[PDB]
């Protein structure tokens, strides 16, 4: 709606924008997380043109313009080369053709530039902006060229961080457009100069001064796009507030699709500085340019600024379905006992990828002096780490046939119980947000899906952003009020729609029309349901590749770790001695048969599995679901079927969750394990607590999964009733033979 | 050749020194009507008596967003300023031994040609005033 001016209206499907998802495996989003972007510097004079590229788009301009302007600055690239070539930074100081440069020469050449510069450089800029003049100088000198890498070395640098700005994607999305075009990503060489350079015998001021007019150049590259980027700011800050109508006839194609965001609407309400600030320099303030087009409507044609930031915005943004997205959501809908016309549970189920297992290599260790960090050299695969593998279909099963038989009075008790703190369920089950139903995520769980954020419904209940979205993705228009939430429409005939007591005191409800400011009302309780979820949650490259690992040697924190397996001593029983003592140093089972009881002590040989003089390196899993948020999902859902009372359910999920940790290390020395006799349960017994105990003795020393939660399933397992402790030992038994 | 070379120059190029508004719906508005603050203004005092007018003048959105213009220096024959000073000499001249016709008639045409070029080149800016028609077009010259 547009009549003359600007005025309220409803779509049923308004849009908040989120990233546009790449594969680029250079950023992290929200959803899906980047631990770590794998770099290289030197191997040879393209390889450093890869990486300088993406240099180009990781790191930030403050970081990236301070380096420009310190090669701008001949005085301090003269002592980059001058302390490159052992030469002294002074207008009679002479090189060679022959001098050949490691990039060992050309770093320790920049630091000596950095330290005599004078200016100040935070931990952060002095490190990225030291790989961006190291990968300029290793191009001069390629093209000159002395360059001649000693070897390839690979680092890790850290991607993009789009973690916060689910809010504003669209500030984020221009700057990062603009970076593509930088001056870092492709030098522009002037080729009579060079040859000044390839010449014998050159002196070094002949260095300084080309690589200070290409930096030079590079500033100037770059004054133009801190300038068409500020362009394209000074668009978006005239979207808003010709959208809250502060400035007067336009319903570009563009323009439409952002009155009915719900973010850049909330954004833009009162105007937003950070894209004000662009209009200080060409009118200025904003305010000063906002009496222009008011006069005016009483230095035009000013429909190409929307244009510009349009390309930039939509390449990096999609919008979403309160359209698409209507996943990637099961939306499963579940009515109580009183079947019509008003239902009990909404199930959402966000699904990813995880990984089952992970590879594990023989290293053996380079020295460094850092403590600091490690090098190793993986050689050979020599395992593959086995998890849990467990299935999450299941555990919502049992849980679907609770809420089914949950009476209409009942839940709206639940409910209560829950709003008042209570979380039986732990944050598997919650108040369905303002809507007196409740919902069953599964991510709150898993990526951080769902967090919540409490600006976007009216009122007081804080509401996750891919609920929001994912709802009024369902919605047929949307109405805009001006320094108001959106208000939704859903029209869809005839009877599939209820009228129920359910939703939020501001929906107006009749069958087939739904009209309120807060979407999830969508699910309360217009018949909306979707089989299987829309988009899979991908990971690029979940591990570090140790692909090139032949060729080359790795620099790692966290993201590789190595064994430190504790060897046994090898005596016939010199082993039972210790391992008895219950206090003693290799890893152990150690359980107390549920046979009536004695302690059992075994010790567990992870020289054998891992092989015999090998320290496993194994990378570090960036999962989006980790075995870790996804046993405490099943045993927050077993719990919470513990009571409301479904021993029936909630004991063959455990049994299942069971059969999973016992048996993937089960079996993997027969006079060793006391105390036992040859029974045949107390035997089968066995079989079960190692096959966990030794999972967990790997998870220790392979940072596959955290202990803590191992042992958190083993207590359950403790408890399990005795009976059952013997049916899944027997399938472990009869399985390992085979 | 300017894009093969630098340029050293004493007075013979000028670069633009431009005040930069404050960027603000109306942080503007609070600085213009004070007649003693610090941007350009237009600031005339209506005919049609006859209140004090004062409007913010926009060089950033006419020079461009970001950019400082060098602007030659011209070494005239026949100067606007030595020109202009003879029009008016003429006009005063005439204006006794008296030609009202004839002197109000060129002051006209040289009024005409001083106020055309800039003009029209921000509604709720300029203060103060009300949706007069000429209180309106008489900014319209005193702008321009």
Redesign the interface.
Known sequence: DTAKGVIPFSTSGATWAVPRLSEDGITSHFLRRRGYVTMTQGGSRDQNAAVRKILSLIIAYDIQTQACFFISNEESMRITMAETMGVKDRPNARTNSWAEVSDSDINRGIAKALKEGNLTLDENQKDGFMKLVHAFVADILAQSGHYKPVTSVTYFSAPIDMESDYLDPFSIAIIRDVLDDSPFSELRYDARAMSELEDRDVPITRFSRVMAQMGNAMVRNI?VL??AA??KL?GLAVVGEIVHG?VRYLNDSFIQTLRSNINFHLLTRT?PERW????????????????????????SDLTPLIRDAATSVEKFVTFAPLSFYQGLGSVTQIRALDSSTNLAAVIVRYAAKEINLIPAYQSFQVPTVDVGVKKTAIMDQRLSLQLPEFSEDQFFGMLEQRMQNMSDSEVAELVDRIAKGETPFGDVVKQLPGTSTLLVTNGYYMGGLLTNEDKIIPGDASVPALLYMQAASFASSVRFPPGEYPVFHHESSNGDVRLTDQVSADAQLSHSAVETANPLNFLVACNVSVHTPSIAIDIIEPMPDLTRRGTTEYVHKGEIKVAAIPSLPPKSADRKAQVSRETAKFERVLYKARKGGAQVAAPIDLESLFGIAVNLAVPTVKHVYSPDSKTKLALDIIKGLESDGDKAAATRLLMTLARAYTGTYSSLDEITGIAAQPSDVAMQEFALQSGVQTLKAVAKHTGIMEVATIEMVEEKVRSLDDNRFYEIAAEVVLRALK
């Open positions: 004054m801190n300038e500020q362009r000074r502060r105007t004000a600030q662009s209009w200080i320099q060409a009118f200025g303030s904003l305010k000063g340019w906002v009496d222009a087009i008011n006069g005016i409507a009483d230095l």
